[PDB]
Amino acid sequence: YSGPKLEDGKVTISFMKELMQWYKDQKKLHRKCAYQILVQVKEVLSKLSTLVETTLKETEKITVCGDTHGQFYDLLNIFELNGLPSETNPYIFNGDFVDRGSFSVEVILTLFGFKLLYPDHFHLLRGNHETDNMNQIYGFEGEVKAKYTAQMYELFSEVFEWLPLAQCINGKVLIMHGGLFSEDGVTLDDIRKIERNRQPPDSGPMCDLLWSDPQPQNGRSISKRGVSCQFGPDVTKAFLEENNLDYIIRSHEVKAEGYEVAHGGRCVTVFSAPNYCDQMGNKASYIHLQGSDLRPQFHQFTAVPHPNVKPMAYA
Ligand SMILES: C[C@]1(C(=O)O)[C@@H]2CC[C@@H](O2)[C@@]1(C)C(=O)O
Ligand SMILES: [Zn+2]
Ligand SMILES: [Zn+2]
């Protein structure tokens, strides 16, 4: 084996550079190195709150991405358009890193390496696809078994359970994959206290965080997805008021332009998988936020070429 190796058993910037190129060229990280990454990142993630709370100083910026769904070559394109992660260039990836796209292993191990290299400046939040039920149907479980083993898949499932469920920037912007709640009165402290190391329940706030969607009319509706609900602009306004927040940023729905701003400004969708499943034809975006001005700035981008492997090839 002549591929990327850890230095004195730890990730370094020179290792991360070697790995992205290794993967671009369709090569596999040695199982021993993938193991060390998974055990080290479980350790780091298991120490974090369910609600990650981040302060951005007035000269600091952060980038927010939505669903990536194993589109590794579009992930590389984000880093080329927007720069490598670093202490001065932090990132948040907002769930659904795996499933649907056929380079989910490359996406998740690159994201984990950067989490290890920059633990205070590189942030991962759980999506509805970081779960067993979903991985078993939509491709990730099949992909890991094909490249590694069932055992390695079990380790991934365990690591995913330690992903935090939401992130609050400067006590003003709350970020989750799905959205708000099926009941009125949920608070930030309620989120902090969720015992998250598990597969999510069929109902309740951990379910809602990963699964809900906005609707335009006031009220709530039963979801067409069969779990959680659709929430109206009355629900969003009430939640922001109680928790002294400005707005929310969520993902979980494909948008033709890469983003959407619903509820009069209060409920932003960001989606980071362009030409989703090689079929949608949609643009993607990421958001920039700055400590001195937390209003979202949208940066759009389009799909780049990838090797000839079809979506869901491992599903
Ligand atoms: C179809 C999708 C998925 O299965 O995750 C994929 C396309 C939009 C969004 O991401 C989606 C609806 C989601 O469930 O989060
Ligand atoms: Zn989703
Ligand atoms: Zn998704």
Swiss-Prot record:
Activity regulation statement: Autoinhibited. In the autoinhibited state, the TPR domain interacts with the catalytic region and prevents substrate access to the catalytic pocket. Allosterically activated by various polyunsaturated fatty acids, free long-chain fatty-acids and long-chain fatty acyl-CoA esters, arachidonic acid being the most effective activator. HSP90A and probably RAC1, GNA12 and GNA13 can also release the autoinhibition by the TPR repeat. Activation by RAC1, GNA12 and GNA13 is synergistic with the one produced by fatty acids binding. Inhibited by okadaic acid.
Amino-acid positions noted as binding Mn(2+) 1 in the UniProt annotation, renumbered to this chain: D67, H69, D96
Main localization category: nucleus
Catalytic activity: O-phospho-L-seryl-[protein] + H2O = L-seryl-[protein] + phosphate; O-phospho-L-threonyl-[protein] + H2O = L-threonyl-[protein] + phosphate
Catalytic residue list: H129
Cofactor mode of binding and number, as noted: Binds 2 Mg(2+) or Mn(2+) cations per subunit.
Class in the EC hierarchy, top level: hydrolase
Keywords for this protein: Acetylation, Alzheimer disease, Amyloid, Amyloidosis, Cell membrane, Cytoplasm, DNA damage, DNA repair, Hydrolase, Lipid-binding, Magnesium, Manganese, Membrane, Metal-binding, Neurodegeneration, Nucleus, Protein phosphatase, Repeat, TPR repeat
Single GO BP term: negative regulation of apoptotic process
Binding site for substrate: H69, R100, N128, H129, R225, H252
Stretches for region Catalytic: 9-315
Localization annotation: Nucleus; Cytoplasm; Cell membrane
Function: Serine/threonine-protein phosphatase that dephosphorylates a myriad of proteins involved in different signaling pathways including the kinases CSNK1E, ASK1/MAP3K5, PRKDC and RAF1, the nuclear receptors NR3C1, PPARG, ESR1 and ESR2, SMAD proteins and TAU/MAPT. Implicated in wide ranging cellular processes, including apoptosis, differentiation, DNA damage response, cell survival, regulation of ion channels or circadian rhythms, in response to steroid and thyroid hormones, calcium, fatty acids, TGF-beta as well as oxidative and genotoxic stresses.
Protein's name according to its UniProt entry: Serine/threonine-protein phosphatase 5
Species, as recorded: Homo sapiens (Human)
